[PDB]
C-alpha cells in the first residue's frame, strides 16, 4: 500500500497554484483490478458466453417452471445413467447438462433484479406521498383545535368583561 505523494506535494501552495479536480471519465477505467467500463448493461446477456435455450417469447414465469421441471427430469435421467451404463460418455454431458440448466435458473431470476429495484422506488414514492399528506392532515387538525381553543378563550373574556 502507498500514498499518492506527487499530488500531495502539488497541494501545498497558495494563490491559485493548487490543482483542479480531474474531469469525469466516460470510458474504460481500471479501478481495483477489474476494468468496469461504463455504459455496461446491469444484466450481461446469456448469449455472451453460454448457450440459450429459450426464445424471445420469454414469459419468465412459464420458463422458470419449465426449467424447474427440466432440472428434476434431468436428475432422474442422470439416475438412469447411473443405473444403466455408468461408463457412458453421456454422463459427462449430463453432468454438464443440468449445470447449464442451473445457470439459466439463476440467469432468469437475476433479470428480476432491475425490475425489483425499479419497483421498490415506486413503492417508496407512494409511501413518501402518503406520509406527506398524513402529516398535512395531522397538522391541519391541530391547527383547527388551536383556532377553536383561542376562540373559546376569547369567548370567555368579554364574559369576564
Amino acid at each position: 500500500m502507498q500514498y499518492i505523494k506527487e499530488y500531495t506535494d502539488e497541494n501545498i501552495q497558495e494563490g491559485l497554484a493548487p490543482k483542479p479536480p480531474p474531469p469525469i471519465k466516460d470510458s474504460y477505467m481500471m479501478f481495483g483490478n477489474q476494468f468496469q467500463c461504463d455504459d455496461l448493461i446491469i444484466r450481461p446477456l446469456e448469449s455472451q458466453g453460454i448457450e440459450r435455450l429459450h426464445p424471445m417469447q420469454f414469459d419468465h414465469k412459464k420458463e422458470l417452471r419449465k426449467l424447474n421441471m427440466s432440472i428434476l427430469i434431468n436428475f432422474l435421467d442422470l439416475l438412469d445413467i447411473l443405473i444403466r451404463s455408468p461408463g457412458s460418455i453421456k454422463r459427462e454431458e449430463k453432468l454438464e447438462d443440468l449445470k447449464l440448466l442451473f445457470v439459466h435458473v439463476h440467469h432468469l431470476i437475476n433479470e428480476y433484479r432491475p425490475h425489483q429495484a425499479r419497483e421498490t422506488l415506486r413503492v417508496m414514492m407512494e409511501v413518501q406521498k402518503r406520509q406527506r399528506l398524513e402529516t398535512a392532515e395531522r397538522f391541519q387538525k391541530h391547527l383547527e383545535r388551536v383556532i377553536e381553543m383561542i376562540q373559546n378563550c376569547l369567548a370567555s373574556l368579554p364574559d369576564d368583561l
Binding site: 421441471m69 435421467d77 445413467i81 444403466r84 457412458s88 454431458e93
Partner: protein, 75 residues
Amino acid sequence: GPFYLMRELPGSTELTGSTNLITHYNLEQAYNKFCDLPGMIDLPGSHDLRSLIEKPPILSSGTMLAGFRLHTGPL
C-alpha cells in the same frame, strides 16, 4: 411440451455391475468347487531357515564334472 435438454438414455441393459459377473464370465463351476498343498504335496513327500531362504529367493525373483569333482569318502 418437451422438457429442456431431454436426450436418449443408453441401451436398456448393457454391461453393468448389476449382472452376475462370474456366471457371465464362465467362472461359476470353479467357485462351486472352491466354496494345505503343503499337506497335499506331503501326500507325496515327508514334510512341508534355508526354506526361508527358498522363499526369500522366491521373493527376490558340467554335471559329469560335478560327479567327478564330488570326491568324498564313506565313513
